[PDB]
Amino acid sequence: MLIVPYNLPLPGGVVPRMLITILGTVKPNANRIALDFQRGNDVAFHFNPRFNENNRRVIVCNTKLDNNWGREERQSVFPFESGKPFKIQVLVEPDHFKVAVNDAHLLQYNHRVKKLNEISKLGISGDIDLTSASYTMI
């Protein structure tokens, strides 16, 4: 297993048609997972499955600019289960990140950070065993 938190460099940033694939297994009794697409210290796209927010499961997405979190986007569809292997695919498209989990479309997140070619790292953290993190141009 990869060491978590894990930093995957994204050389020259992201671009439409870049597909990022994360394979891992949720820990038993997980509380949270995060994918952070970073532009330096800014987080262009935070994808945050929360396993227990007031005894509900939700995905929170947001952007962090100059150390401040913005307006959350929430998705109640929650495909992750404690103990189970998952695949997250993040396809960069011209206006959004498009996320599929286990081959099913989950959500899209509109680009708030405009300089896609400066979003040069993906941080992967939280309550998983991380199997692999990779990208390809489709």
Ligand SMILES: CO[C@@H]1O[C@H](CO)[C@H](O)[C@H](OC(=O)c2ccc(C)cc2)[C@@H]1OC(=O)c1ccc(F)cc1[N+](=O)[O-]
């Ligand atoms: C106001 O709270 C923040 O909201 C931000 C989004 O607007 C971020 O999600 C930030 O997340 C982390 O800092 C974070 C996320 C994942 C990891 C592995 C490490 C760090 C933080 O969330 C929690 O503290 C939070 C609040 C209530 C919750 F039930 C669950 C969470 N949470 O998952 O962090």
Ligand SMILES: [Cl-]
């Ligand atoms: Cl920008």
